[PDB]
Amino acid sequence: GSSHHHHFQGPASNKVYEKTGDSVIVKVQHKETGGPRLVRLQVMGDKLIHVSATADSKFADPQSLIVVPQKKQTSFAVVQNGDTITVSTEEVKASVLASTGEVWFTDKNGELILQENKGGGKTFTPIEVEGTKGYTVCQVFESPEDEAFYGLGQHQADEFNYKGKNEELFQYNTKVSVPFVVSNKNYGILLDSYSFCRFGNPNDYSQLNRIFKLYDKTGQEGALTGTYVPKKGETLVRREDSIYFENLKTIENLPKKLPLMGAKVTYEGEIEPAQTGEFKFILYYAGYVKVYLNNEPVVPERWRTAWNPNSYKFAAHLEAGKRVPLKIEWQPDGGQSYCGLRALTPVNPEEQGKQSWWSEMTKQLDYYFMAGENMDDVISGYRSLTGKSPVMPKWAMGFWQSREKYNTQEEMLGALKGFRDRKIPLDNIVLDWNHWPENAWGSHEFDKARFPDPKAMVDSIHAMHARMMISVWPKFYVTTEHFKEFDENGWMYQQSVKDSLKDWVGPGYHYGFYDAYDPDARKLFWKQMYEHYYPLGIDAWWMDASEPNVRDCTDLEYRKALCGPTALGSSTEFFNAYALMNAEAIYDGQRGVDNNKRVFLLTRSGFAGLQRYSTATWSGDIGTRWEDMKAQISAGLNFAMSGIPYWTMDIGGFCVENRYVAGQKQWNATKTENADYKEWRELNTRWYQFGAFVPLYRAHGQYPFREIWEIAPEGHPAYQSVVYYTKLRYNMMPYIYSLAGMTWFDDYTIMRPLVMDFTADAEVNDIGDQFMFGPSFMVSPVYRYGDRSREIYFPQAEGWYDFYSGKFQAGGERKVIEAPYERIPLYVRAGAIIPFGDDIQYTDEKPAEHIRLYIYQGADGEFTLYEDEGVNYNYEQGMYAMIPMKYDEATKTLVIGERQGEFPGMLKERTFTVVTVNKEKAQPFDLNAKGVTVKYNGSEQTLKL
Ligand code: NI
């Protein structure tokens, strides 16, 4: 007979399933090769289900690094009905088939939310690394044609809406992976894996010679042609097997006696596929690069510096057996540089549209399903499971000025005094790397020739009502006492030491990175910061290189060798979570010393759960490029949808084109602006406009200097515009800090793609170049040089108002909108209630005694004004105040609600001026606008407008 035919309180091994206190474990009845043997549904909350699966006959159940203990027990029922076993909470029903182990999720009325690949979507393949064992796992779900996906972290290919798309999940300077996706069907999936993972296609890309017949410039099969024109000397022409010069090993395949700086290289020929469909390409690049395929400019010019390269993707339909031309034009722009092109063969759209996860190494499959009423409610599930985001200190919501690098104490203090003397508001100033004696990275001591009195410096920063952040890497020179403390305990990764790697500083120094996965190493790492930096009064920690970035431009295999073994297992298994571990070290470290003082970290990598450690990510060493500016909009919106609500970027870009440096040097010498310097000023103007509406507003990068008065002088349009937006950030502070309060109290998200608030309007699904800043402002950056307008789509809504003029704009249409040099297009949603305060030089310079409450009429609205002490965790004990406000359009009524809570230093009495904007009343933004004066003492008042 068949395989099935042959094989209340009895042992569970006799039963198809076993119910425990919070879960059901089902034994797969029709076992397949590579398939699951056990599938568990564990109830974590009313809307929260933990799915586990394994090929073994028991679960390994390792402790999660990302999921925290939950607050309450959750009631649920289980029903077995033939092959179907269903776990039901008040809000969701999760079902599994005993036959296959396939899972699906419905709402309380049985409406489908998410279904596993029909017949099962889980595959297990054994893997062994360094005597440890686990599985490579695939999990695939069905996905309808109208499903849209957001999240995965922060990637640099300008992709937006991951439906039908691919992404590799590893960590590298500018690329932050978070294994969490949110759907427009109002659920999220969190994959609990720490290894290299993939969303979409589970395979690596292929070199061009593996998937195409190649013909060179003369038509000879078997290669492309490479033509190398050096800056000086004879041109070299050779055949190329493959275009793959992507890491330190493979750049040795470029021509041996041909200097790349100032060279112009052309790769060309024809490619011929053996199957028909959409081929998906990936370009890896540094220097200047363009790509043409079939005579189309598929990659218009991009640039990176020779040493932080990037990836960019494109796709094209190709016909089997037809030759099409391919040309890559490349200016390496350095002695070392990178260029590679790879591709994936076509995947049937029925399969490519599915939601597919691949994970290189875990002990079992673990994922979390979270349902919601809307996308904010999905994010709330993520915050329940991986921890709430604390309210950032209020000062973190102001302007941050940084540099790579302030070289001396005088330089740093001079920059800060420069803001105060010009009445350009600012809260935070940042000291970068190499403030230590050159040969002593990791000593945490200051070079006293350049910083003669570090404590006096921090005291002076504080006396000017500013806050200081300092750079701290996980990197230690081998000669330092601090290195030796880690090393003697086995807590330093050895590969970089064994291989005698030298860094880039001076003559080159030997170094290593500490193992953040070891809990005692974390304590020591914090203790060294506590003994050397904390007594100076430093307020914030810039935790750079937390990928960990042990060695730039190394291949996957060697990156794994460089960052393990770890305390928990191999680096193959524990590959992506370093920044989470490193952030725990500092957050739990500092609250251990002083539990009331707020913590701030800014870190270069990230992972699921990062937000629970009061830690933001910045988007890393990006270029001074319009295309990089555009990519940060989509990167930021995906990062926000990954559950982590504090994020920032280097306004202006980090690595600088040589022509911009030359422009600045010319300005310094002659006060004349060349064409490149004109572009520098416009790039920075537009990028500051954009940055004023991201969660943390921060300028940073390499030379030129980035203080606004260095970019352009007083009176120049660039200076005028940037100062306008820096001031506006502070007039918006009552609104902005209310959003910060909401991150903790309401599990809120600050920088929001349009799909969050306008999910019902599918025209927003692919829009990754506009966004909402809190509930009320729609921001549409200009990201092309010379443009004085741009196309904007206005979501379906009762209406929109131009912020600057108050002029009405209908919802549900796309049009060309004016965007002068000095202005970013900025609209306000009908129903907005927005509190604006007076000019201040820094957060809480003065109490917000007089607030203008702007009411943008035409729809109902709500807003809660949140205030607290700003600098400590007293809000956790109920020391804060909320003033809820509600506006009813039908009766034109505003209620300023009874104040809830109090705290030390709170205004008991204050003033509101209520200002209306409506379709018949185009009121420009104006602090002095005419309105209704309200003297408020905490008691409810009602206004009929
Ligand atoms: Ni020490």
Author numbering: 1 to 7, 17 to 954
Article sentences:
In this context, we recently reported the characterization of a novel xyloglucan utilization locus (XyGUL) that confers Bacteroides ovatus, and species harbouring syntenic XyGULs, with the ability to utilize this abundant vegetable polysaccharide across sampled human populations. Here, we present the three-dimensional structures of BoGH31, BoGH43A, BoGH43B and BoGH3B, expanding our knowledge of the structural determinants required for xyloglucan degradation. Our analyses highlight key adaptations in these enzymes that confer their specificity for xyloglucan oligosaccharides, while also providing a rationale for the maintenance of two divergent genes coding for GH3 enzymes, and similarly two divergent genes for GH43 family members, within the same PUL. While we were unable to determine a structure for BoGH3A, our structural and sequence analysis of BoGH3B has also allowed us to highlight further potential differences between these two enzymes encoded by the operon. Together with existing biochemical data, our analyses of the three-dimensional structures, and various enzyme-inhibitor complexes, of BoGH31, BoGH43A, BoGH43B and BoGH3B provide molecular-level insight into the stepwise breakdown of xyloglucan by the BoXyGUL.
Within XyGULs, GH31 α-xylosidases play an essential role removing xylose from the non-reducing end of processed xyloglucan oligosaccharides. Indeed, deletion of the gene encoding GH31 from the XyGUL completely abrogates the ability of B. ovatus to grow on XyG and XyGOs. Consistent with this role, the GH31 α-xylosidase present within the Bo XyGUL (BoGH31) has been shown to be highly active against native XyGO substrates (XXXG and XLLG, nomenclature according to), rather than disaccharide-configured activity probes, such as Xyl-α-PNP, despite the presence of optimized chemical leaving groups requiring little protonic assistance from the enzyme. Crystals of BoGH31 were obtained by hanging drop vapour diffusion (19°C) using 0.2 M potassium thiocyanate, 14–20% (w/v) PEG-3350 as mother liquor and were used for subsequent structure determination. However, by far the closest structural match to BoGH31 was CjXyl31A (Z score = 33.1, with RMSD = 1.15 Å across 888 matched Cα positions). As observed for CjXyl31A, BoGH31 presents with an extensive, modular structure featuring several accessory domains appended to a well-conserved TIM barrel-like structure (for a full description of terms and domain nomenclature see). The catalytic core of BoGH31 is composed of residues 384 to 758, which form the central (β/α)8 (TIM) barrel fold and harbour the active site (discussed below). The domains decorating the central catalytic unit include an N-terminal β-sandwich domain formed by residues 16 to 213 with additional strands contributed by residues 363 to 383 when the peptide chain returns from a PA14 domain (residues 214 to 362).
